[PDB]
Amino acid sequence: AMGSMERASLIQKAKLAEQAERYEDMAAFMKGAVEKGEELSCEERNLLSVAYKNVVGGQRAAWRVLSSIEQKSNGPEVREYREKVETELQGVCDTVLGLLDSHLIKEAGDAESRVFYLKMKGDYYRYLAEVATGDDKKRIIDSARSAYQEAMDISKKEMPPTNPIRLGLALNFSVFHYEIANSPEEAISLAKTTFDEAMADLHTLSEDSYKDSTLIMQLLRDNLTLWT
């Protein structure tokens, strides 16, 4: 779709689409930018992630509304429309996963980029798992777990415990344990250890880095308060 537009113009337009709250456009611009074949900078990776998180976030919210109505009802219309939204959501997750597999992850050698993309891979398999039913659920769950675990292993070797990507990875992997894997104790353990190890490293940070890390720490604490 975007093959005739310059990479730099796609990135420029993704930033404008964010300002305009046009997240489907933003995601299509950033897909086009990935498909140019070059690696993404830190800022570009964040544009890609913001675009798709907004698109899939709206789909997930709609799927949950429809699934709730369908469960209460238990004609074909509610199920048919939940299925339509579900298929669209799955298609977006498959598109993101396909960008990561062709070829963002394999070309990502620095820890910052490789962890970022593996966290994305865990997230989009987790969104697939949210709507999956049965044994399909099992293999999809294991794919999320494996991506998050590889990201965790790299992050713990290569990043300080306050790094925001390391923190957000741990947060989202703890949500995976709590909400998807039926492992609330593993979720609580991971959130507590992550919080405590970040706290002990705050003294090393500038004022601005302190603000970035403490914001995500508060999200870990907010989950611990809900879970305990």
């Binding site: 964010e18 992630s49 913001v50 998180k53």
Partner: peptide, 9 residues
């Protein structure tokens, strides 16, 4: 339970 909102650059 909240994940990273992740919706604003």
């Amino acid at each position: 339970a909240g994940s990273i909102p992740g919706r604003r650059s």
